[model samples]
Target chain A: MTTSQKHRDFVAEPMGEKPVGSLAGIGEVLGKKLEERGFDKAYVVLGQFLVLKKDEDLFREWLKDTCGANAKQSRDCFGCLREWCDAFL
Target chain B: TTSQKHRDFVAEPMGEKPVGSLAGIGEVLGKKLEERGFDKAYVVLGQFLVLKKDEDLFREWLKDTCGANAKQSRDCFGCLREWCDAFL
Candidate 1:
């Protein structure tokens, strides 16, 4: 579950003022696309996560659809955010 | 002076509070927020943090989203901001 070091690092903090690229599965490429699509900040994506009410399946699907992430990548992102919500949200 | 709503909202963890319980969100605004699926206080807080607490954007969005006036938006924004500062 805690596969990506990036995911671990991400959920470890408040996520203040972090860019969209700071998310685990999102790199320069996907991050750029997400920003272009108006998800310019980590918090913006976190907005979506909360709006989806932290539903794992729904969030995972949304991530895949929105960012073209693979199963692992999308799940990685979802897991990190889910964990962050548990600890913080 | 802070409203009692503000004090109560800012007093503790956000466990199970409704958006209707938020300082700026009374029944009228609360109903509107629910129409957009923001029934929980956390939902609005989610949005505020997403906007990075930008007064301009946050206020503008609130105005447009549920017809909140200047004062209404500011109250909502302040509550959410404080919550984040302490917890999120």
Candidate 2:
């Protein structure tokens, strides 16, 4: 229900089909918003990340602008996607 | 030939490939799109994401970009859609 641990489950691999909430910092509410806008899967978000060239500011801003992810939430999600890109993209 | 190279594309983990390697995009189209800046599969995949992977948008953009027809865009979209399914 709250953040604590490093996002091992999310940042560790190329989980292409995982739900939007599976990303660090994305909970049910934000996940629902994203999916409603058509980003139903983690890979879809990753695609947007790649499109932004993985720029942290743009990505974080996108998360915020899209679903109103708070500062901490967007940061957690950005770092997770960044590490995933480093590992797989 | 449709099923051959295409099936080969969806066979296993591709790791990565040039945009031309995608089904329906030959060297000429690849070069054309590449000239517009998409050089590899991931770039177009990024474009797909930009389009939200919608059927209509991807098809229209495909046709508008380098003149890919209905079947051609269908094949190209199928390739990335399959890639996301299996590997991403």
Candidate 3:
């Protein structure tokens, strides 16, 4: 998926109030599930990312547990947040 | 009455400090933040970054979340802002 392409775009700027769907690998279904569970905005998910201390396994596990993300999707999402933190945090 | 809190908070990484450790969040505001599950300084920092570090937005959120006054919210924002500039 050339993860860097999308990853670069997301981390290029602050995620301010962007919908959770805007996160990489989070499409309609997962986004809706996340929103229902109180992670409506990208920053809200970023909040969880920081709360988890940016741990790869924990954050990926939490994503899967929260919204049924598959391995690739979870990995992509994790990478997205990790890079964002490195760039902006 | 004190910018000391701001200075201390910005002086280093917050690590695992309690929410009250944030500048301007004393016992009263701290208690309220804890009740809402923002028991850690990092969680509030998350919210700060989420707002893109916008001063007015963060200040308003502080007021809404814990009824912080202008001076208190401003101090808190300044503390976090400086910390971000220093450490992210």
Candidate 4:
């Protein structure tokens, strides 16, 4: 189930250096938070995704912890990354 | 002449492989990488993907991080790029 247009857009390509804001559910505020923490690029976040071995819980928790993403936001972000990996990773 | 390691690395998913297994990363480079938290090939792959597979940026990062020389950095970059093409 594709969640949103943002998710579709994110999953459609290689994500090469795209801003973290390009991710679904990330928007401006959270994206800024992530950027401040050195996860400025989508690929940097993807790096963490791979480093966490794509574990859903761990990644979701990390998103929440790193940027104060709420449950729905974290879930959307997780799904976005998961689907991106399925298609490209 | 020295592409066998590249071929071997790109032939399959890197799953759980050590950083030492990457092309051009010998015992010394591997040890340096391990000391810097890049203990896993996948972690290095993370950096590769993070850099958007850019040749210059990734090579420069490798050189700065672990003192990988030009040829060594090139070999490693080529290996990851091919792996991404085949499996990513």
Candidate 5:
């Protein structure tokens, strides 16, 4: 699916216990890396986001460092989380 | 101030407390945070949970966003982190 499609679907509702792959910008490769690093679930990533206080820059940087995400990929993921927070968090 | 109140507040699940319940978040700061769309403690908790409990980073962001001083930010972070340890 497209990034926007993924973003929309991710933020649409509570991500109960979905895998990290359910998130936008976290495809197979990045999702595997994140899972290996204990972020196996979308809610786990959300936990990290909250632990960072929802700062976009810090989150983006961590994403890049953790999973080698480029700027655009990190931004897409951040936007997805921000919108998800707006909707559900 | 009431440290007991702080401990109690941080000890239990923060079901839906007002933003003011957080340490160092008085009426003024709470109002500012509310105006900026953080009307609920859960919303702020959501942000905290998202950050993965990074102390320095979380403190810095609180300072930048609400002009929270170091102690203020640290107290708030500790409060939320402790709450999460207990409940989340």
Candidate 6:
């Protein structure tokens, strides 16, 4: 599926107890890394975002550091989260 | 919009609303927030709860991080606080 495919799927419903990989832009490698780092569930990452009060730079930096995501990856992931929040948060 | 939306939204349980429902977080702020890992409003709500709803701290944090103005930060803080009061 395309990136927008992932995006559309993610925003279509409540993200209850979904895994980290379920997020748009978080593929297997990144998901595994996040899981290894104790972010097993998407909600845990969400906790971190909330902990930081949803600051973009801090979040992007943390995501890069956490999963080795490059700029584009981080942006896509962040956009996914933002859209999800708009629809559901 | 009026504070009533904020009041009503936060006044009850968040259940599973998206993060965009927040008062000051429009599409732009919401995107910025999500890029940072706050995809869910509940997650941000958790942070607010953890902070014990300190207005100054929350406002300052919001301002510094998201560049929210005083009114924006206050409105966001107020929305979350009232939401917690009714539901959390």
Model 4 C-alpha lDDT per residue in residues A2-88, reported as the tens digit of each score: 589999999997776579999998989999999998789887888888767678899899999999999999889888988887776
Judged by DockQ cut-offs, the docking class of candidate 3 is acceptable
Candidate with best lDDT: 4
Q: How do the candidates rank by lDDT, highest first?
A: 4, 3, 1, 2, 5, 6
Once fitted onto the true fold, the runs of candidate 6 whose alpha carbons sit more than 4 angstroms away are A1-3, B1-44, B48-88
Docking class of 6: incorrect
For residues B25-58, write the lDDT of model 2, one tens digit per residue: 8877898888876777777787786676787898
Residue B88 CA displacement from its true place in model 5, Å: 11
Tens-place lDDT digits, model 2, residues A39-81: 8888788878876756789999999989889999999998887
Q: Please give the lDDT score at residue B7 for candidate 5.
A: 93
Model 2 fnat value: 0.41
TM-score of each: 0.83, 0.73, 0.61, 0.67, 0.55, 0.54
Off by over 4 Å in 3: B1-21, B25-44, B47-88
DockQ, all models = 0.53, 0.37, 0.26, 0.40, 0.20, 0.15
| Whole-model alpha-carbon lDDT for candidate 4 | 0.86
TM-score of chain B of each: 0.93, 0.85, 0.95, 0.95, 0.89, 0.85
Off by over 4 Å in 2: A1-6, A13-16, B1-8, B11-16, B35-37, B49-56
Q: How much lDDT does each candidate structure score?
A: 0.82, 0.79, 0.83, 0.86, 0.77, 0.73
Clashes within 3 Å, all models in order: 0, 0, 0, 0, 18, 10
For B1-88, candidate 4 gives per-residue lDDT tens digits of: 4588888888876777889888989999999988988888888898887676779999999999999999999889889888877765
Q: Candidate 2 at residue A30, lDDT?
A: 96
- What's the CA RMSD for each of the models? 2.4, 3.7, 5.7, 4.1, 7.3, 9.1
Q: Quick one: best DockQ, which candidate?
A: 1
The DockQ score of candidate 5 comes to: 0.20
